[PDB]
Amino acid sequence: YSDRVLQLTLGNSTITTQEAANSVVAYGRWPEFIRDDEANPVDQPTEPDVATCRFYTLDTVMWGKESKGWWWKLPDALRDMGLFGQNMYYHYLGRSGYTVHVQCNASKFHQGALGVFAIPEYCLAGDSDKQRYTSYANANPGERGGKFYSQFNKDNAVTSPKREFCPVDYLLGCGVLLGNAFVYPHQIINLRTNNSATIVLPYVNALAIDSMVKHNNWGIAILPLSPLDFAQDSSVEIPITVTIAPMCSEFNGLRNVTAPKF
Amino acid sequence: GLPVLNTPGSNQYLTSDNHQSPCAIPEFDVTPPIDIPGEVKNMMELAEIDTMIPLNLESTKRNTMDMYRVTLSDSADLSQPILCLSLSPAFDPRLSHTMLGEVLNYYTHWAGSLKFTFLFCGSMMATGKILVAYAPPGAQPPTSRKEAMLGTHVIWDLGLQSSCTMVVPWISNVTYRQTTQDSFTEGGYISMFYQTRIVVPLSTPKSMSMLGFVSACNDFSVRLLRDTTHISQSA
Amino acid sequence: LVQSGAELKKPGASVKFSCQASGFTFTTYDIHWVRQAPGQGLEWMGMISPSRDSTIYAQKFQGRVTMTSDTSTSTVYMELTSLRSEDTALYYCATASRPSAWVFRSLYTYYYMDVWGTGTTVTVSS
Amino acid sequence: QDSLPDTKASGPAHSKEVPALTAVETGATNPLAPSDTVQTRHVVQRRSRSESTIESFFARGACVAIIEVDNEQPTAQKLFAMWRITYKDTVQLRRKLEFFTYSRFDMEFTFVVTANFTNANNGHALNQVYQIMYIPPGAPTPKSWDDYTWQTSSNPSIFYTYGAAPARISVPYVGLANAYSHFYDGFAKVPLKTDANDQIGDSLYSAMTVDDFGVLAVRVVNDHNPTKVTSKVRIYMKPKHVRVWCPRPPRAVPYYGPGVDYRNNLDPLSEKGLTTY
Amino acid sequence: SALTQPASVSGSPGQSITISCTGTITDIGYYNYVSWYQQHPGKAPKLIIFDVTNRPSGVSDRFSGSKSGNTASLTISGLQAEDEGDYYCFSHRSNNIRVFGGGTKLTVL
Amino acid sequence: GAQVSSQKVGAHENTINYTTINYYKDSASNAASKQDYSQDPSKFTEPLKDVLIKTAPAL
Ligand SMILES: CCCCCCCCCCCCCCCC(=O)O
């Protein structure tokens, strides 16, 4: 056996990789259900196990020579993924951990490096002079995610503002220098070394359980630390695929379904 | 009434006092803690994490993503250094905004060993070697490999192990070096040179990035708290 | 009392306003400029702070409008460096000197406009 | 007993085990002592990390507010002032706390009051008593300097007399959660498809609550002098019994509002040549 | 981007009327710097409420003010014929600009 | 009802204790017991599932 070869299985789903580089359990803590001395709600929790805790694959994003980065938010990227998204919308409170698997495959002649960072409470900076004015529909883009930018272009549409983020890439979208983002739970997909990265995320929050529709516990940021080069080609595009499984999903406060405006 | 004498320093406020004080909200029912992942007991656990160095602070490269990547190539002038850096981790502008430099800019004094880990981001067919060298102060800063190999150095072989760590040992005359710029407690010079060169086959990129990382070893401590230069506020 | 300049009537060209006050109120308090086209309602144009010569302008006017100060006469000025027919308005000069109880950010005092000057019309047409 | 590990003696090596090579793609960082790449002597290491502990790091009190109040007879005058209790409008304590995502601490608040006469001719005034009243969220705020709310039947209050030692109190961990959240990737409200208009569900990004930890109200208790006395209550905030819970990169570009937004000076790094030492 | 107000409001003398002012979450829903201004014809405006529920000296107690969310309201209770005129709402807005309402003409019937 | 503990002596003259008493009912009122010694940094330094040993190859 070698830690380049990993098999990950959750529910009815299985990921096999042959070019891993170990795996990160974030802050040393594997995900767990709520212990009885840490519990806040009195309602009996729904714990669906294999129905929700399975590998869901988001939309593939194409890494090219002018790509500046991509970001997602959890649980928001899984809000339309099957019974997890249905249990998240039908309940007021929800907790889950996550296994985040990023796949990015390239030849021995390609080069490049992606930093995959998992950020607890990944706030992003807005687009405009008005403080904290990013709307819900733009702060929560779903499985599409969002992109980083090379510069802070500022919204001047006074008639109707865009109310989006403007995440600047070396500023990690939130005003901190990107070289210090390695204090977060992280892996590098360096194409001569590994084709995949695995970060296992516990439920990092100031509460035992929280509103999943209102609040994102983790943000996943993927940024090219070294740019993609191949041969002497300007047109290079290789796929990045992000696959997230919830772990230890539990939900409280059943009611009618949340139907957010987007 | 007990006879008492008021010593000097009565009725002062020190801002560093460690004295008891009455409670504005007595008998408050404090919310109990829970086992949140990621607890930090000491700021040196925010050091000993390798964080990436903005090594490339040239005029077009700085304040972009290109500040982190040093261009190695198959056709560089091999006598000349890849990078040069001063071991002043709170003052050198390549080191000052790393997590080690940001922890150290809240402190006046520092002491310990420093890891420098360099990661190679060429293709798998890219091969080569690299001399990375630390020279203690009091001499000419190394301009050639012939000078730099007299110092503490690691010859790094590019292979399946993608990255290599060079440790700067704690060679110092003082027990603690100053974090500000000071020729008395200066820390020496880090230099990097080719030994052989980058060799690539055909249909392979001829230039490639290298990323550098810095962190504290287990022997590292800082000892006098101060305000930082890195944040400011207008009137 | 806060004293305005007289009325202007020219199209296409630049128009400069003048506004003079007492020496204490000039040095202590900010001066705000507000306009009112006929029947259309009040419209904040910007602020000059002669204690420190910082200015803020509304985004409708950020290119067009400059404000300057004179410590010798305790006068502030406003120049509308290009002009249109919709700028036919009564232009008010107002001192922000009624203090709010709420601390602005955490270090400053907010002031509402209370000492309004009589102001002046400018009409922009051939 | 707080001492660091001693550097062990290390001789020359010629070995199949190689400490210097690693893979930072794993996310781990290489745990090397200097003994694992250079020859080292033994040295008994008496240094320690005492000043770098989290309580030692936050032990210094920092200014969070400058509250201004007037005392003058009515003829324009701020006879009382009110401040929403926040750390985020002074940059230094904010940047120190924002190294971490969550934290849990008791507080000390220390109040330094300085007064001055405002015009030179008008002369003297007697010594002033200052009421600093805590108004928790939902409690009634004053609308004058002497209405019924200052009777302080259930509110905490400090009566400071001028010239005394700077008044101080301790406050417990008052957060509704198990730790204070310095950062909040979320909203207070979600807009729904069934909402009558968008402003029912509209709320600020990264805002948990408005009036999160209440309001301090400040007045001079004295009847007004004919001379105008202007006074400033400076508030110094010291976290203590601190536990911090998820490390973050510190703030690089200047702060803009209470969120993570940025507007100006997006150049935190200077110019230095790659070969220049 | 201006604060929304009804264009006109009417009532007979002795009644109570309420002029209202709805802005966005970055002005009235966040700041307490919400003020009201009265403008009789030809006059410069007079500040009648400065902070929410706070009147200046010499403004009669029939004027009163409140805030309910993103909305602020001015209630004139015991309406008189001298109250006829324009009323302009005002707030601070979080990019350090200041914004007036579109204004309400009050006709005393 | 006092507490007593040893100081870490820096300078020496020519093992020394200090005494504290908590005077107030609540824990918030208390002084800072400056004894919050460091942990293992491995939860940030090496957060792996298959934990490496430092002299072995990392892959
Ligand atoms: C008599 C005065 C009593 C003082 C009462 C203080 C009320 C508790 C304040 C705790 C503030 C916690 C820090 C977070 C502030 C923020 O969110 O910016």
Author numbering:
A (entry chain 2): 9 to 270
B (entry chain 3): 1 to 235
C (entry chain H): 23 to 148
D (entry chain 1): 24 to 98, 101 to 302
E (entry chain L): 21 to 129
F (entry chain 4): 2 to 15, 24 to 68
Paper text:
In support of this goal, we map the epitope of human monoclonal antibody 9H2 which is able to neutralize the three serotypes of poliovirus. Here, we solved the high-resolution structures of 9H2 fragments of antibody binding (Fab) complexed with live and inactivated poliovirus serotypes 1, 2, and 3 capsids. For each of the Fab-virus complexes, we find that the binding site overlaps with the poliovirus receptor (PVR) binding site and maps across and into a depression in the capsid called the canyon. Thus, 9H2 outcompetes the receptor to neutralize poliovirus.
To make complexes, 9H2 antibody fragments (Fab) were generated and purified from the mAb and incubated in excess with virus capsids of wild-type PV1 and 2 (WTPV1, WTPV2), Sabin PV3 (SPV3), and Sabin inactivated PV1, 2, and 3 (SIPV1, SIPV2, SIPV3). Strong pocket factor density, equal in magnitude to capsid density was observed in both inactivated and live types 2 and 3 virus-Fab complexes; however, there was no PF density resolved at any contour level in either the inactivated or live type 1 virus-Fab complexes. Another noticeable difference in local conformation was seen in PV2 and SPV3 VP1 loop 96–103 at the fivefold, which is located within the Fab binding interface. In live SPV3 complexed with Fab, there is discontinuous density that cannot be built between VP1 residues 98 and 101; however, the entire loop can be visualized in the inactivated PV3 complexed with Fab, where Arg100 was identified as a contact. For the crystal structure, the VP1 96–103 loops are built, but do not align closely with the inactivated virus structures. This finding suggests that in live SPV3, the binding of Fab may cause local disordering at this VP1 96–103 fivefold loop. VP1 residues 96 to 103 are disordered in the WTPV2 and SPV3 complexes in contrast to the inactivated complexes of the same serotype. The number of contacts does not correlate to the 9H2 neutralization, since types 1 and 2 are neutralized equally well, and type 3 is neutralized slightly less effectively. However, Type 1 and 2 have three residues in common that type 3 lacks: VP1 residues 166 and D226 that map to the north canyon rim; and VP1 P282 on the south canyon rim. Binding at such a similar epitope does not guarantee similar cross-neutralizing potential. Both 9H2 and A12 bind and neutralize serotype 1 and 2; however, A12 does not neutralize type 3 and 9H2 does, albeit less effectively.
